Design a protein around this ligand. Sequence first.
Ligand SMILES: CCCCCCCCO[C@@H]1O[C@H](CO)[C@@H](O)[C@H](O)[C@H]1O
Ligand SMILES: [Mg+2]
Length: 535
Amino acid sequence: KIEEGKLVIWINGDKGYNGLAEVGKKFEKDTGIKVTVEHPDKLEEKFPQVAATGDGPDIIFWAHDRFGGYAQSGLLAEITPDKAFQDKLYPFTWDAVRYNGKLIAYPIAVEALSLIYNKDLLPNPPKTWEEIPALDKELKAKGKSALMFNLQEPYFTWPLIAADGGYAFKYENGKYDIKDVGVDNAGAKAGLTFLVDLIKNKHMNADTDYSIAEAAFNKGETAMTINGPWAWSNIDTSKVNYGVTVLPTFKGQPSKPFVGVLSAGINAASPNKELAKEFLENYLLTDEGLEAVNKDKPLGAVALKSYEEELAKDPRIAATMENAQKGEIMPNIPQMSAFWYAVRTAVINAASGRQTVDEALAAAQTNAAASPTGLAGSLTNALSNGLLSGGLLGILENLPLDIKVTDPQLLELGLVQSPDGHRLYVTIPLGIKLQVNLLRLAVKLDITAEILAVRDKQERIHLVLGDCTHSPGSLQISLLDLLDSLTGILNKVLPELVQGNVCPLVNEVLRGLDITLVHDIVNMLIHGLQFVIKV
Ligand SMILES: CCCCCCCCO[C@@H]1O[C@H](CO)[C@@H](O)[C@H](O)[C@H]1O
Ligand SMILES: [Mg+2]
């Protein structure tokens, strides 16, 4: 139902779709290929629905954070721009469109929060969060306020909270580790305490939301607000004389706002992928193509360097790019929905006093990572938690020859499935620091254990441990601030030593798994179906 020989494009109604249409006219003129621009209501839900029946637009425009979910569902084609083209766009914008090493869409525009200030009230705005209470007192005297912004949404509070070392999920080469959540930390504790202090100290109010902050700033009641480019036109109207600037630092750390990247993906079901590429690369992403769109509805900052250089002559757009460059690309994966909920309740609870700061952050740090996964992830989480409660770390510390063994560690488990799907193999990386006292070393090694399904009694089936054996060449000693003798030595002992203090525990932990997990896993091993992922 998608027609080969034309392009249908979906973009949101708040974007410059008429300008985009003009880009499409130019395209038809050159190629004779017709381009149709639509802005369906809720396209971000519509696209997965129709595209999963093999229908929908050839190209979809949307914030990058949805595209990770679309890629997982097989809805997006991999894009193949050459390196010279990639040099045309800012590198970090390419990271926003990465999924599993692959490029999954063309970056278009860049947006992040900025500090927006009233030049009549505040000709020289503060560079630090810390200055704000002082300003508020002064301004309270004149019947005004220092700072009002939406506290109801963690999107707005995150720049402060994550300022020092904080993150949503950890990024590795266009892969996010959904087990690794950076919510809780000294920065986040300090950052969030400060925010709560401001409410206790009367500088801000906990009930403040988007509409209250916007009115307050747009009526000239408050000197500063925190908002994005979408907010600008309402201020243009308000006759408030305003600047847009770098967010305040907290403890000398830049605020770290989330970055959205408007992006254009290509439908996996499109018969038109090559034309789509041609349109996006040689027509839309050009000084002329972006200008057309921008003149209709302004794009804010853009991913195209040449055009961004022009737009950045507007200090508001330059400030946007600068805040982006100091900010955190929003993870493009669906687990962000747990993250938003965890952080949203935490900040609201701390602000209301329903929880303390450390408590809200501690729950949120756990809750954001709590999204359930398929069999393989479940198994590996299960065994990790098992070994840890089963006291594996303690066992590590207790191995002898001075020495003092320290910093015992379980590392990310590996999982491999038989090509015939009937067999599982787990890798269990382990580590300790050695101290010769002086002379600190890092010892690491793997255990490989086979996981098996077997019938007994004689009908009933069970999940059983195969051979648990120290992986032969896996032992690695690393110097810290004399091998290979030590290694030579250790290889004669550790391997047999570890397996025999460990394999038994591994075997115990296996049995302590949730029973439905066990049954489910057994079932797919029996029938040789692959639940395990190539990495
Ligand atoms: C208002 C719409 C402007 C968007 C078009 C931007 C530039 C397109 O320019 C086109 O590039 C093609 C190859 O790269 C050439 O084949 C065409 O001759 C040229 O017209
Ligand atoms: Mg860059």
